[PDB]
Design a protein around this nucleic acid. Structure first.
Ligand SMILES: [Mg+2]
Ligand SMILES: [Mg+2]
Ligand SMILES: [Mg+2]
Ligand SMILES: [Mg+2]
Ligand SMILES: [Mg+2]
Ligand SMILES: [Mg+2]
Ligand SMILES: [Mg+2]
Ligand SMILES: [Mg+2]
Ligand SMILES: [Mg+2]
Ligand SMILES: [Mg+2]
Ligand SMILES: [Mg+2]
Ligand SMILES: [Mg+2]
Ligand SMILES: [Mg+2]
Ligand SMILES: [Mg+2]
Ligand SMILES: [Mg+2]
Ligand SMILES: [Mg+2]
Ligand SMILES: [Mg+2]
Ligand SMILES: [Mg+2]
Ligand SMILES: [Mg+2]
Ligand SMILES: [Mg+2]
Ligand SMILES: [Mg+2]
Ligand SMILES: [Zn+2]
Ligand SMILES: [Zn+2]
Lengths: 97, 38, 261, 177, 71, 162
RNA sequence: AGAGAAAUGGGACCAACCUCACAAACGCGUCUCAGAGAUAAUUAAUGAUUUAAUCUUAACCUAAUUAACUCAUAAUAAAUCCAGCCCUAGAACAGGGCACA
RNA sequence: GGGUUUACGACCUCGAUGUUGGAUCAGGACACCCAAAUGGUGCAACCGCUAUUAAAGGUUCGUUUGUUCAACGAUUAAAG
């Protein structure tokens, strides 16, 4: 979470993580959710909206990040590592932001 | 840079790297902590 | 063949007449040397693969000499060529695109006013001279007590070496060696008498043969573009050049006596 | 066996031309057999006073191979005699300047330290690549074996042998290469 | 085995006079200096130039005129 | 094997994970009682820098080493295999395990010097100018010292310094 | 970063002055002086062992990079006539001339 | 770690290894003065201080003292 805290996340509008807690590949998804919902990310910018969608029969975790460059980053993370998702999101928002 | 025979970190930000056949204590916070094993 | 950026041109073999002054339009005064191109003929042509593997070689002969003092082989070569024997025979390394048929004469109009050249010749051989005149070593004082040491070189080596090093400067032959001066600018080109005015000192005594070539300095490597690439052919243009080709800064003999403003 | 004296002597002390490939070969192991064949220590009729010597043609000299980091550690120091003319050329720089010089100096060192060294060196022929004139090629008799077995690359192995070589470990599917 | 090569070509034969054509290939000669001769001999026999030089009286006197022979 | 696929569709990046099929271990190991892979396949003190088929089982397509926690090897053999992989890469084996750069493959350089059994890096060793005398000799190291316990069919010890 | 000027030293020559009662010698006088590679120390690009980072006694290509040191380039680089007479060529020996006059 | 001053022992020479300073000639080493590329500074810039790599080239002219040294005058990029 320190990476997203020091990267200046002021340039994001909405981050939603849609998942189902009763699946078998939600570890990295919930890790990413906590890393983006940490207190430092919140204190970096207060205008952002963090949403955690919880379902039971979706069976497909996903992350949608809409930011004001007219950009929509969609990551269907079902087998990717939480660290890989975090570093990819960081590189993308640092390249376009 | 300081050429020494025994390198040692001076703060928690110095990292030891093996380069050019020697050891180098590199510090980004305090640049005066740059040490090189002779 | 057309001119190329990585191409070179053949040189000449002239006769050093003497020295003269030459005033520039800015009021300055330079010293020129007169080189007379008496007879320049391409004797033989050696191919690139047969000479160096990188550049072809052209053989150039100097002025005319007598048949009654050359050997059988040289006279046979000149008989098969159809030309009288030459005194000095030199080799010029040129590219494979600037080759000329052997037996072709060359003229001092080969160069144009404003250019840099190189000059090679044997300097004035002063014979077996002392070290003070050869290398410039300082001598000992004259009369403060020195006995038979007014011009000795002194110590020649050290003690523990128990010998002298091969590069030790010592009295020996001085002067008779092929030396080359680079980057000499040419001012005036006389077409009638085939005289070239080369700036600066030219190594070699007067009335001697001198090998002139294009300046191989890196600052003047691509200056052969506006000049005639193969050589100066007086029959190709069907036009006679002026008597004296002056540079853009040489104060010509006929001048309005320029004054500053 | 029942030859005349002159042809028997000629066949006994005849000279032989050998071939030696130096591609991916150590200069030491090359110069070993090179000096052996030069001195003639492969003939039971060898003697010091006799001039029994054979010619060796070493090809693919530029493609020589040094073991270890000698390419950057080993130096070849020469001196022109003049003061300050003491040059120390790295092995790589010397090989880049002249590809023959490496194996030439190796053989010149492995040969004995007598006057016959120049004589038996004049019988040596070293070529950087496989560009041998015909008058030299038509002299070869046989080719000596390579002293070092050249190891295969990964793409040089056949797929049947690749599948014959068993898999040691079972990688998990969740990992990313 | 491989067959025996046999090369036979006398290009000096002229249709005008065979008596002259026979001598055209026999009157060939060449004379060089000591240096070039020694160099060519060394290049031919794959030796150095130090062997082809002659020797002195002190060594040419001490050679045994009638050396023993075995067999 | 897991692969990260990225799709660019109108300022919208789609990053997805794709799992492919990976080959499994051979069915019959010669010594199933060993815990370590090499120690149970009885390849201990058997592999070398020449054995490419064994070293190529666990290396990233870009020549990288595979982590020990995922491989499963004992520490000593892992270090030995790392040394062997470094030596093979320096020697010139594994040609298909280099990163593809179409911009850098065009400007060819001086030819790669043929080397093998190299210990250090080609760009980190200074040439010996003193070279020492017979009693004090600066020995030139060749090969890794970790492989001194290989089986010697000739019986002579391996010259680690020459 | 861009223009010039000078000195030292390497190598040369008398158009003028200076030494100068030989036609030459000489400085105090005049002319010229260079392209490429490589690096040691030190920076950054990608990247694993250590799924992050990290200039790498981890590979593959990377780039600004001390002087040396080599190489482009230049100098010599047409062999078997030499009695005699000259030479800005020379101790002797060598070398260049003796046809325009 | 080096053998640059003094001393230590007297191993080589006392049927001879001629002894300090200067003139000429310098060769070599780097434990680098300048010139070249850098790191760190209580480095704001000019001046500075130290460390690394680098030896192709240089390291002045005078008064006094026989002086090596030593003080002073004028400079240089420096007077190792
Ligand atoms: Mg003279
Ligand atoms: Mg005087
Ligand atoms: Mg007296
Ligand atoms: Mg007296
Ligand atoms: Mg006197
Ligand atoms: Mg001695
Ligand atoms: Mg000068
Ligand atoms: Mg005078
Ligand atoms: Mg990474
Ligand atoms: Mg960083
Ligand atoms: Mg060269
Ligand atoms: Mg003569
Ligand atoms: Mg002493
Ligand atoms: Mg003592
Ligand atoms: Mg004694
Ligand atoms: Mg005594
Ligand atoms: Mg005595
Ligand atoms: Mg010196
Ligand atoms: Mg140093
Ligand atoms: Mg400096
Ligand atoms: Mg010096
Ligand atoms: Zn620090
Ligand atoms: Zn194990």
């Amino acid at each position: 979470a320190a990476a997203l805290a020091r990267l200046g996340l002021r340039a994001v509008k909405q981050v939603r993580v849609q998942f189902c807690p009763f699946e078998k590949n939600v570890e990295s998804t919930r890790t990413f959710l906590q890393a983006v919902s940490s207190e430092k990310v919140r204190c970096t910018n207060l205008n952002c909206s963090v949403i955690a969608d919880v379902r039971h029969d979706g069976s497909e975790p996903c992350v949608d990040v809409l930011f004001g460059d007219g950009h929509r980053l969609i990551m269907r993370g079902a087998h990717l590592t939480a660290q890989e998702m975090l570093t990819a999101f960081a590189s993308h928002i640092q390249a376009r932001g | 840079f300081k050429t020494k025979g025994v390198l040692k970190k001076r703060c928690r930000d110095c990292y030891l790297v093996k380069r050019r056949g020697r050891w180098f204590i590199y510090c980004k916070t305090n640049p005066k902590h740059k040490q090189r094993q002779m | 063949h057309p001119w190329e950026p990585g191409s070179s041109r053949v040189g000449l073999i002239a006769l050093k007449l003497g020295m003269m002054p030459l005033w520039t339009k800015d009021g300055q005064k330079h010293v020129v040397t007169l080189l007379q191109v008496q007879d320049c003929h391409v004797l033989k042509y050696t191919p690139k693969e047969n000479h160096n593997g990188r550049m072809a070689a052209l053989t150039v002969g100097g002025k005319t000499v007598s048949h009654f003092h050359k050997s059988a082989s040289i006279l046979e070569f000149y008989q098969e060529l159809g030309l009288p024997p030459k005194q000095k025979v030199k080799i010029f390394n040129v590219t494979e695109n600037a080759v000329i048929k052997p037996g072709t004469p060359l003229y001092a109009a080969h160069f144009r006013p404003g250019q840099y050249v190189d000059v090679t010749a044997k300097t004035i051989g002063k014979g077996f001279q002392g070290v003070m005149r050869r290398w410039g070593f300082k001598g000992q004082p004259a009369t403060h007590g020195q006995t038979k040491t007014h011009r000795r070189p002194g110590a020649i080596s050290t003690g523990d070496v128990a010998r002298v090093w091969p590069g030790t400067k010592m009295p020996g032959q001085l002067g008779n060696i092929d030396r080359t001066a680079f980057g000499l600018k040419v001012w005036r080109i006389n077409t009638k008498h085939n005289i070239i005015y080369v700036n600066g000192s030219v190594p070699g005594h007067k009335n001697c043969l001198v090998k002139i070539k294009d300046s191989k300095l890196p600052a003047y490597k691509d200056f052969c573009k506006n000049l005639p690439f193969p050589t100066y052919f007086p029959d190709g243009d069907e036009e006679a050049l002026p008597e004296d080709l002056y540079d853009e800064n040489v104060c010509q003999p006929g001048a309005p006596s320029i004054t500053f403003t | 066996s029942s030859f005349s004296k002159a042809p028997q002597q000629w066949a006994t002390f005849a000279r032989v031309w050998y071939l030696l490939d130096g591609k991916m070969q150590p200069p030491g192991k090359l110069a070993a057999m090179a000096s052996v064949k030069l001195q003639g220590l492969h003939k039971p009729v060898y003697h010091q006073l006799s001039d029994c010597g054979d010619h060796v043609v070493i090809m693919n000299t530029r493609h020589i191979a040094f073991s270890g980091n000698k390419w950057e550690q080993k130096v070849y120091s020469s001196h022109t005699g003049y003061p300050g003319g003491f040059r120390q050329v790295t092995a790589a720089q010397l090989h880049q300047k002249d590809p023959v010089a490496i194996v030439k100096l190796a053989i010149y060192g492995m040969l004995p330290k007598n006057l016959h060294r120049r004589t038996m060196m004049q019988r040596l022929h070293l070529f950087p690549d496989e560009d041998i004139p015909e008058d030299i090629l038509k002299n070869l008799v046989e080719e000596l074996p390579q002293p070092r077995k050249v190891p295969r690359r990964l793409d040089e192995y056949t797929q049947e042998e690749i599948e014959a070589f068993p898999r040691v470990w079972s990688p998990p599917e969740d990992y990313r290469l | 085995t491989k067959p025996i090569p046999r090369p036979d070509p006398v290009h000096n034969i002229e249709e005008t006079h065979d008596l002259v054509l026979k001598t055209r290939l026999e009157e060939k000669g060449e004379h060089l200096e000591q240096g070039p001769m020694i160099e060519q001999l060394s290049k031919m026999f794959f030796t150095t130039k130090h062997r082809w030089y002659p020797r002195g009286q002190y060594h040419r006197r001490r050679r045994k005129p009638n050396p023993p022979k075995d067999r | 094997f897991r692969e990260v696929v990225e799709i660019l569709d109108g300022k919208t990046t789609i990053i997805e994970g794709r799992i492919t099929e990976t080959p499994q271990e051979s069915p019959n190991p010669p010594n199933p009682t060993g815990q370590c892979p090499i120690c149970r396949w009885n390849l201990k003190h058997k592999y070398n820098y020449e054995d490419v088929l064994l070293l190529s089982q666990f290396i990233r397509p870009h020549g990288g080493m595979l982590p020990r926690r995922i491989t499963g090897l004992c520490q000593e053999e892992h270090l030995k295999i790392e040394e062997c992989v470094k030596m093979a890469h320096r020697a010139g084996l594994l040609p298909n395990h280099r990163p593809k750069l179409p911009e850098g493959f065009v400007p060819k350089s001086k030819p790669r010097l043929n080397r093998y059994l190299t210990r250090w890096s080609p760009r980190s060793v200074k040439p010996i100018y003193n070279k020492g005398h017979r009693w004090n000799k600066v020995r030139m190291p060749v090969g890794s010292p970790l492989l001194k316990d290989n089986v010697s069919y000739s019986g002579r010890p391996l010259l680690l310094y020459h």
